Amino acid sequence: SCPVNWVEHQDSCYWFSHSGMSWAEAEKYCQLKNAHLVVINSREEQNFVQKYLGSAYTWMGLSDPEGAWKWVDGTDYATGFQNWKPGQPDDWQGHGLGGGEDCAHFHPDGRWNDDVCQRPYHWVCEAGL
């Protein structure tokens, strides 16, 4: 059902990187594989993904560059599953790299943070069946 190097869970296929990329390069990579950065739709999917994270910060398909949080596939953010770290998202500017923080990633414990999109983090692709 899933292609080789992809993991099947509950009607999605997932691919977990062994490397890091900026958020935009990871979403380009997922799109080239007819997929997208992972969209977390439920607690059960959050638990599956967080269980197999490669012990490093990992991008997901959630960003707010135009001002509101959006999932790459159009899943509604505000009515959807959320799993932020305490005090996140904060759009922090104190990194001094310019602007705030517009891309969401997993901490190893599975809780989410907004960070600078240009950081090379691991990522997860997802595609339907």
**Tokens (6 digits) for 30:** 């997922």
Nearer to Ca ion, 32 or 112 (CB): 112
Q: Say how many CA atoms lie within 13 Å of 43 toward its Cβ.
A: 0
Nearer to Cl ion, 53 or 89 (CB): 89
Which of these segments, 20-28, 55-63, 89-97, 117-125, binds Ca ion (CB under 5 A)? 89-97
Q: Are the beta carbons of 10 and 45 closer than 8 angstroms?
A: yes
Torsion on CA atoms 117, 5, 8, 80, rounded to nearest 10: 0
How far is the C-alpha of 87 from the C-alpha of 125, rounded, in Å? 27
Q: Does the protein bind Ca ion through residue 37 (CB under 5 A)?
A: no
Q: Does the protein bind Ca ion through residue 80 (CB under 5 A)?
A: no
Q: Does the protein bind Cl ion through residue 2 (CB under 5 A)?
A: no
Q: Are the beta carbons of 55 and 108 closer than 8 angstroms?
A: yes
Is 64 annotated as a binding-site member?
yes
Cβ neighbours, 10 Å, residue 50: 17
Nearer to Zn ion, 12 or 113 (CB): 12
Is 113 annotated as a binding-site member?
yes
Nearer to Zn ion, 41 or 88 (CB): 41
* Residues at the site binding Cl ion, with contacts judged by CB under 5 A: 12, 82, 84, 102, 116-117, 119, 126-128
Binding site for Ca ion (CB under 5 A): 18, 39, 41, 48, 64, 88, 90-92, 100-102, 107, 113-114
